[PDB]
Amino acid sequence: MGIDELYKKEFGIVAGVDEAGRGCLAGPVVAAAVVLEKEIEAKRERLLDEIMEKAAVGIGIASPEEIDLYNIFNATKLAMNRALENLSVKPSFVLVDGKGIELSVPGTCLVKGDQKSKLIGAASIVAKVFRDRLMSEFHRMYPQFSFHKHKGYATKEHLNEIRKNGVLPIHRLSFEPVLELLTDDLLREFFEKGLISENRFERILNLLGAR
């Protein structure tokens, strides 16, 4: 909509920040931070290629473990800050998709920022394309799960897969739909095998015990 134009001149280097995967049942939250010089007008992958040519980009991830330990809001912020740390240029100001998120660099959050700002639009594209590739990797690791299709979102098929095959360490064990399927025995298996940390094990065992 052109909101970036307001921030072009008084705010030093400005980056746009967005995420992919906040709403998922499995996998990380992936954040992108983007500083664009040049003008930019699977249209996603078309745009990714132009972004790659015309922007400085940084990527930050927060794992299922971190989501389970810190909560989805803190984990998303952790990813976003990591994305800013990953940028080769240090921005002076950030435009962030959402509401009430305070990052390591001062900024402003825009509700539906991905429709209002080109910078944030560009960050949303990078984060989505890159997270989608990762989820396709996870279908290779866990072929009983169609992560390549649902991307770990709680679709009918994903839920059917969890019910039939069991929860995985890459599931967000603290989220009700997963937590309600998880057994004490499977959780102990994960810990026994070194598939989850002791901190994560204890956290989820508490959540399960209080049920």
Instruction: State the Cα–Cα distance between residues 28 and 127, nearest whole angstrom.
Output: 11
Binding positions for Cl ion, 14-73, rule CB under 5 A: 65
Instruction: State the Cα–Cα distance between residues 173 and 209, nearest whole angstrom.
Output: 13
Question: Binding segment for Cl ion among 37-45, 83-91, 143-151, 190-198 (CB under 5 A)?
Answer: 190-198
For residue 113, what are its two tokens?
Answer: 């920022």
Question: Comparing C-alpha atoms, which of 63, 103, 69 is closest to residue 87?
Answer: 103
Half-sphere exposure of 24 (CA within 13 A, CB side): 27
Smallest distance, Cl ion to C-beta of residue 197, A: 4
Per the CB < 8 A criterion, the answer to whether 119 and 1 are in contact is no
- 121 forms part of the interface with Mg ion (CB under 5 A): no
- 126 forms part of the interface with Mg ion (CB under 5 A): no
**According to the annotation, is 184 in a ligand binding site?**
no
Residue type, 59: I
Question: Binding segment for Cl ion among 53-61, 85-93, 121-129, 200-208 (CB under 5 A)?
Answer: 200-208
Binding positions for Mg ion, 69-108, rule CB under 5 A: 97
* Binding residue positions for a divalent metal cation: 18-19, 97
* Residues of this chain that bind Cl ion (CB under 5 A): 65, 196-197, 200
* Residues of this chain that bind Mg ion (CB under 5 A): 18, 97
